[PDB]
């Protein structure tokens, strides 16, 4: 339950081509759920059949490297306080305010600003699309 | 039943890699079983799953070419007699005879001849293997 993995496309593996929808799992380990797993990668790489939902192969290195026994390299405040004495004091705020509103005008997805006019679109792939 | 094909390895097709044991069929057509099918190839190429014993894909050209309507290009005597008027007359024989036997001596697969001595092996892959 402490073993995690980032699921990636296999990218391309000549052993299977497009004959099977595959993923490769970059394996990591957390000694605690709040850890950043990236300090503890594992040395092998499981290949998974997306549709069949099962591991069909595991790429294992000739040279084996067991889990790192070092502390995880974490970054949340509690972690930091522990790492370095404590967190830096909150800093004086810099507040940004637009009392009379903004100068741009949006009509649906159509934007209007400083003489510019365009449509702001968006899709699953490209993300933002200006037209 | 007039459609034939020479079964080849797919060789290599990046669409499947080694994920499936595949064959590609070079398709031909005989208007008569005694024909040499090679004057009549077809334009498409079926991909077959060896283990599953079934066509999993067919490569079809963008430009279609239907069966040739010409006579098959045959080479057996009956074909030749028809093609050119007739066969050449049998030629005077040249007989080779070794009345007192051969000069080489084989002891099992071991050969001995003209001071040479070697073992004649054979296997499924390489064929003859001299050792």
Report on this model:
- It is classed as amine oxidase.
- Keywords: amine oxidase, quinoprotein, topaquinone enzyme, TPQ.
- Copper amine oxidase from hansenula polymorpha.
- Chains A, B: methylamine oxidase.
- The organism of A, B is Pichia angusta.
- The structure is cut from a larger assembly and holds two copies of chain A (131 residues).
- Chain A has 131 residues and is mainly β.
- Chain A has a domain at 1-83: Nuclear Transport Factor 2, Chain: A (Roll).
- Chain A is 5% helix and 34% strand.
- Chain A contains one helix and eight strands, in the order ββββαββββ.
- The first copy, chain A, has one helix at residues 77-83; strands at 3-9, 22-29, 45-49, 54-59, 105-107, 110-113, 116-123, 127-130.
- Chain A has a four-stranded antiparallel β-sheet, with no helix packed on it. In chain A, strands 5-6-7-8 form a four-stranded antiparallel β-sheet, with no helix packed on it.
- In chain A, a hairpin with a 2-residue loop joins β5 and β6 (110-113).
- The radius of gyration of chain A is 24 Å and the shape is flat.
- The two termini of chain A are 47 Å apart.
- The interface between A and B is small, with 8 and 8 residues.
